[PDB]
């Protein structure tokens, strides 16, 4: 109070000093039910992957993509991300993603990074230097390597110019390795542009085959349809909390409600836009939002020249949430209730007043309206005064403010 009034002395009365507001005890978060996972079993446990010149492509869209299972997938001999952290991906959103995927010798994984050179990058699938996305690979010798050699796995060794970023090129047309006219048939100076790894079980751990996926991320003019999977909490009731429902952030005492929403409706508004109720997105109860308990704090006091005992009103706040006494004005604290209901020394509210009284303490009570009088009226009778008194009564009225003037240019601009 002293700190509020900018004074070391305070006169008898009541002063509002501050705001009381129950804290958000924890956070509740809710999202749509566990649904619509992207088809990544068909991207990492699938039976085969392509010859890299004709690398597999699939549109990923309209689904949540869990990257946590992928960064947890310890069987990945390679798992890397560029432009972004792998841990951040379960928060991100994109229009599309693509599962750009194939087989290569493990040695050429050196080329499978942003902006790199070499046969696979330059002639099969060009990674740009700006690549915002991830590379994944794992050894596949037990599937893709074969006795006498698996020749079915092909890569473009020869091309006249490099591929553009994430371009694809099937073209089997004969690489004319000189002035010799090849006319699209194999021979001297006329090589198949595609060449075979011929994977044999004798190959060293890098020369062996690896299955590969590159995750091409894409945000465009069309809204996001690939997102990292959101996480719902348990839902506490009847206690003040921070909350979110989908995108509807708020804070309050969430409760059950009687409200009969139409099935498509997600949340309510009150008389003047304020969000008053919500559908839960995982089991479709309608919850009320009710305001988190708040009100002014006021200090009730005798004159500081007279005592330093003080009492506090929490304006309109019920005592349950905060000596202690309940009132229609809110909870009163430090004061002592009494039945004997005197005139007001200090006003509180709702008929309640407080005073400093006898070892003296702040008492609080319903106020007197003055002494009662049953007048002895009867149409038979009158009273007439036998004696009288002059009285003198002070009355005080202000007539002038202090005549004040300001040079607005001096006040504003010095």
């Amino acid at each position: 109070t002293k700190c509020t009034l900018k004074s070391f002395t305070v006169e008898k009365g009541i002063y509002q000093t501050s705001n009381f507001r129950v804290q958000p005890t924890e956070s509740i978060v809710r999202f749509p039910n566990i649904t619509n996972l992207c088809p990544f079993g068909e991207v990492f446990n699938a039976t085969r992957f392509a010859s890299v010149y004709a690398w597999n492509r699939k549109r990923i869209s309209n689904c949540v993509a869990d990257y946590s299972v992928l960064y947890n997938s310890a069987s990945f001999s390679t798992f890397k991300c560029y432009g972004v952290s792998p841990t951040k991906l379960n928060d991100l959103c994109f229009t599309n993603v693509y599962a750009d995927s194939f087989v290569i010798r493990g040695d050429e994984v050196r080329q499978i990074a942003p902006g790199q050179t070499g046969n696979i990058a330059d002639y099969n699938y060009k990674l740009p230097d700006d690549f915002t996305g991830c590379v994944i690979a794992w050894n596949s010798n037990n599937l893709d390597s074969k006795v006498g050699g698996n020749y079915n796995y092909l890569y473009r060794l020869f091309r006249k110019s490099n591929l553009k970023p994430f371009e694809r090129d099937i073209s089997t047309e004969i690489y004319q390795a000189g002035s010799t006219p090849c006319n699209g048939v194999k021979g001297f100076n006329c090589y198949f542009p595609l060449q075979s790894y011929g994977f044999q079980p004798t190959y060293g751990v890098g020369y062996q085959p690896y299955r590969v996926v590159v995750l091409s991320f894409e945000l465009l003019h069309a809204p996001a349809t690939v997102c990292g999977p959101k996480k719902s909490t348990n839902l506490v009731k009847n206690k003040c909390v921070n909350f979110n429902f989908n995108g509807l952030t708020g804070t309050g005492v969430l409760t059950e409600s009687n409200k009969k929403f139409l099935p498509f409706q997600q949340f309510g508004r009150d008389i003047a836009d304020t969000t008053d109720a919500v559908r839960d997105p995982q089991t479709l109860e309608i919850l009320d939002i009710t305001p988190c308990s708040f009100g002014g704090v006021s200090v009730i006091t005798p004159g500081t020249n007279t005592s330093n005992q003080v009492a506090v009103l929490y304006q309109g706040v019920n005592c349950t949430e905060v000596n202690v006494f309940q009132t229609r004005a809110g909870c009163l604290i430090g004061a002592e209730h009494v039945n004997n209901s005197y005139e007001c020394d200090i006003p509180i509210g709702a008929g309640i007043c407080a005073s400093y009284q006898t070892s003296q303490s702040i008492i609080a009570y319903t106020m007197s309206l003055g002494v009662e009088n049953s007048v002895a009226y009867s149409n038979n009778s009158i009273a007439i005064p036998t004696n009288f008194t002059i009285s003198v009564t002070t009355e005080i009225l202000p007539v002038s403010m202090t005549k004040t003037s300001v040079d607005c240019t001096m006040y504003i601009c010095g």
Binding site: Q16, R21, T249, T251, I271, A272, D273, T274, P291, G295, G296, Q315, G316, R328, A329, P347, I348, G349, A350, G351, M367, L369, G370, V371, E372, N373, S374, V375, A376, Y377, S378, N379, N380, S381, I382, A383, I384, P385
Partner: protein, 369 residues
């Protein structure tokens, strides 16, 4: 309570403090008004069980002791007819049940005790004699009331019945009080509605801005919203200051109407409503007060020939307490504001000089008792 805004609000210093002092000023004025109208009495008078009030049937305007909170019947009609970010709606200092005690006590004094319960200790007086004094107040000789006491009581009870029907059959009499609540509900709803407005900012959802942007961009956007919300509050509080000064002008008028029109018989023409004033009763209503003024209104009249004096022994005579009138055949003296003819006499008149000065004087016999 979103912390980035809570930091940035400290840029503006005193504004977001001094509005609570301004609104505290408004708050105290409400209980100051309510006190200065209703607390104009030192003791809570209460009425005896009897109803010997000369047939005046005050049962409708007195408290019903069975009523859930002790309103009169007519106070209950009035109570029935009159009809969350950062908001607080404080209690009045006095409850509706307390106001009913004040409107009881004032009325109990006004019924039992003349004006005296305003001017000193309340002195009991028979109610017919109080009306007889109030008739004397408007210039009618007190016998005229007593000689019509039953008829006046029957008129008064009829008028009270017509008040009940007037108040019940249309709300349009209470328009002022409903208007005052409507203005406040309108102002608060618009003050709340302005939170949805955008003020040249990217959004009016505060935490949305914090989610979309660079900290620096968000500070610009949030300073816009602070600027808008601030100007909204300064607008609203400006309205509430002006409105409270208006309602306090009404309160000082009401406080005057209590002291002059209930506790007395303030003669001021067309202060206590239409007609010559007799008395008035307060009744409490939500946020306000309702006066039942009781007033004498003349209603049937006749023409007479008149002379400003009469001449007798060559001395001019003037009417002592009234005016001279005739139907051509004789002359009578009468009281100014009600027909009550009397014989012209030396004591019903006074002498002033010889007749020859007075324009329109007439020759007639003064009977000398």
């Amino acid at each position: 309570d979103s912390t980035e805004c809570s930091n940035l609000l400290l840029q503006y210093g005193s504004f977001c403090t001094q509005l609570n002092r301004a609104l505290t000023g408004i708050a105290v004025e409400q209980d100051k008004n309510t006190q200065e109208v209703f607390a104009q009495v030192k003791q809570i008078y209460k009425t005896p069980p009897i109803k010997d009030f000369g047939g005046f049937n005050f049962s409708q305007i007195l408290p019903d002791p069975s009523k859930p909170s002790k309103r009169s019947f007519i106070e209950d009609l009035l109570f029935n007819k009159v009809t969350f970010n950062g908001l607080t709606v404080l209690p009045p200092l006095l409850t509706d049940e307390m106001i009913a005690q004040y409107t009881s006590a004032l009325l109990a004094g006004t019924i039992t005790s003349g004006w005296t319960f305003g001017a000193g200790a309340a002195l009991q007086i028979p109610f017919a004699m109080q009306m007889a004094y109030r008739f004397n107040g408007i210039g009618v000789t007190q016998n005229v009331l007593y000689e019509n006491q039953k008829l006046i009581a029957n008129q008064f009870n009829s008028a009270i019945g017509k008040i009940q029907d007037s108040l019940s059959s249309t709300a349009s009499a209470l328009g002022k009080l409903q208007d005052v609540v409507n203005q406040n509900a309108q102002a608060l709803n618009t003050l709340v509605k302005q939170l949805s407005s955008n003020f040249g900012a990217i959004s009016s959802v505060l935490n949305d801005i914090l989610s979309r942007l660079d900290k620096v961009e968000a500070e610009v956007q949030i300073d816009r919203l602070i600027t808008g919300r601030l100007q909204s509050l300064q607008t609203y509080v400006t309205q509430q200051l002006i409105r409270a000064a208006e309602i306090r002008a009404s309160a000082n008028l009401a406080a005057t109407k209590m002291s002059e029109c209930v506790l007395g018989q303030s003669k001021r023409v067309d202060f206590c409503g239409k007609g010559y004033h007799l008395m008035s009763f307060p009744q409490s209503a939500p946020h306000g007060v309702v006066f039942l003024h009781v007033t004498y209104v003349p209603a049937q009249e006749k023409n007479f020939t008149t002379a400003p004096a009469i001449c007798h022994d060559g001395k001019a005579h003037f009417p002592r307490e009234g005016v001279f009138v005739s139907n051509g055949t004789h002359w009578f003296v009468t009281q100014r504001n009600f027909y009550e003819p009397q014989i012209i006499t030396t004591d019903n008149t006074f002498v002033s000089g010889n007749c020859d000065v007075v324009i329109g004087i007439v020759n007639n016999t003064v009977y000398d008792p």
